[PDB]
């Protein structure tokens, strides 16, 4: 068996769910054999009919075309960041602060 895998719009998937779009939920997914994790929101991009998936500067997927629905379903525009802790010395007190 020779797989033309992730070089064209794929059609052979065993299990699927075909869940509708949902906002503010940066969670995992799997689009045509490509896995990601992010929210699924709208966009104002006018995609040409032949175009299927877009790519950014970093060659990371940021757009997709869903068959039988023909919608955007943007790829991983979800929030992320780091957490910082601010506290004085242990000899004075032990109170802490949480900063994002």
């Amino acid at each position: 068996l020779s797989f033309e895998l992730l070089h064209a719009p794929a059609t052979v998937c065993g299990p699927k769910k075909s869940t509708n779009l949902v906002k503010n939920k940066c969670v995992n997914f799997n689009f045509n054999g490509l896995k990601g994790t992010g929210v699924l929101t709208e966009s104002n991009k006018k995609f040409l009919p032949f175009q299927q998936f877009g790519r950014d500067i970093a060659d990371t997927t940021d757009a997709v075309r869903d068959p039988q629905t023909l919608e955007i379903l943007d790829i991983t525009p979800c929030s992320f960041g780091g957490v910082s802790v601010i506290t004085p010395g242990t000899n004075t007190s032990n109170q802490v602060a949480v900063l994002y």
């Binding site: 033309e4 699927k16 769910k17 506290t87 010395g89």
Partner: protein, 361 residues
């Protein structure tokens, strides 16, 4: 010989705290005046644990655990005697049994037949099992033993090793720190998914004294432990409990200076799948190249393009009706999860001397 209990009074279990309990030596490494952080099954601080009280209250619960049960109990007059460990607590599977009479402890694992309500009863009555069929293990060690004594026990099962951590101190859980040194390691190498607590009754029908024990859950996390100049553990730090101990674990020091510090990052964990590709109206006819009435030769094979369908790879990977299945450039375990456009199936017959040649290069 087992006797059922009828005078039990119904009462839901209570919950208590685990302020400074559940610490133990992760390994057998001696250190002198250094703070070390390690990954091991450790009980989180300020975690809720189940409290059982025995007085006319009888508490003999059965709960499924994989490994890592922290057994702490305030003890007087040696009410607690034995423990039960196993998978189904019958003769069909091997079960670990701990007993201790007035002379010494006995450690035995066997396919013992366990009744519904096993317990203990001058003590001369021993009614916890009926027969032994498939076992040969035996081990004998020295005896381990108002509230006056506190006993804490940790049982773990990693890589087939049964580690027992014990600590006895004279005295809810008291506010203090006591590192639980390991007691004995048992090379059993079996599975255990159930446990049962055994109690001793006093005859003077039967009377039970005041006793209480705690059951805790062990979780995999990183603890920052301190080893003094003489090798004993003084304090413990949980790297994911509060931001103060997170800063202590990140800086590898028990004291943090005044200022802004960075420890980790905030992320949103996945919860549900929004896979967006409606399924294809037909299934993949994989039997065309497998159950064909005739096959082609190696030099001129038959190529059948299978596309626009839904495949099932359980007959190839999960099930093995064929002699040899192998995948080089794709994962055989996750064959069903992937999505490809088309597949070109080449069917041909090769003698057993040259079947190794079907590989890249």
């Amino acid at each position: 010989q087992c006797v059922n209990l009828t005078t039990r009074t119904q009462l839901p279990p209570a919950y208590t705290n685990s302020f400074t309990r559940g610490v133990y030596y992760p390994d057998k490494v001696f250190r002198s005046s250094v703070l070390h952080s390690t990954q091991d099954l450790f009980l989180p601080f300020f975690s809720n644990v189940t409290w059982f009280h025995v007085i006319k209250r009888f508490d003999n619960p059965v709960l499924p655990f994989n490994d890592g049960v922290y057994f702490a109990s305030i003890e007087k007059s040696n009410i607690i005697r034995g423990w039960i460990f196993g998978t189904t607590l019958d003769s069909k599977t091997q079960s670990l049994l701990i007993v201790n009479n007035a002379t010494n402890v006995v450690i035995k694992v066997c396919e013992f037949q366990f009744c519904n309500d096993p317990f203990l009863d001058m003590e001369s009555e021993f009614r916890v099992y009926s027969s032994a069929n498939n076992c040969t293990f035996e081990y004998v060690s020295q005896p381990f033993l108002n509230f006056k004594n506190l006993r804490e026990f940790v049982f773990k099962n990693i890589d087939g090793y049964f580690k027992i951590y014990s600590k006895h101190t004279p005295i809810d859980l008291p506010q203090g720190f006591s590192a639980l040194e390991p007691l004995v390691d048992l090379p059993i190498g079996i599975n255990i998914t159930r446990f049962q607590t055994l109690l001793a009754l006093h005859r003077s029908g039967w009377t039970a004294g005041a006793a209480a024990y705690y059951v805790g859950y062990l979780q995999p996390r990183t603890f920052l432990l301190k080893y003094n100049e003489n090798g004993t553990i003084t304090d413990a730090v949980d790297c994911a409990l509060d931001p103060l101990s997170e800063t202590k674990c990140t800086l590898k020091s028990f004291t943090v200076e005044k200022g802004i510090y960075q420890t980790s990052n905030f992320r949103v964990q996945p919860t549900e799948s929004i896979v967006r590709f409606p399924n294809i109206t037909n299934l993949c006819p994989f039997d065309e190249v497998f159950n064909a009435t005739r096959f082609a030769s190696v030099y001129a094979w038959n190529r059948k393009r299978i596309s626009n369908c839904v495949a099932d790879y359980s007959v190839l990977y999960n099930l093995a009706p064929f002699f040899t299945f192998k995948c080089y450039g794709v994962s055989p375990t996750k064959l069903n999860d992937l999505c490809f456009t088309n597949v070109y199936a080449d069917s041909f017959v090769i003698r057993g001397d040259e079947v190794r040649q079907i590989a890249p290069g």
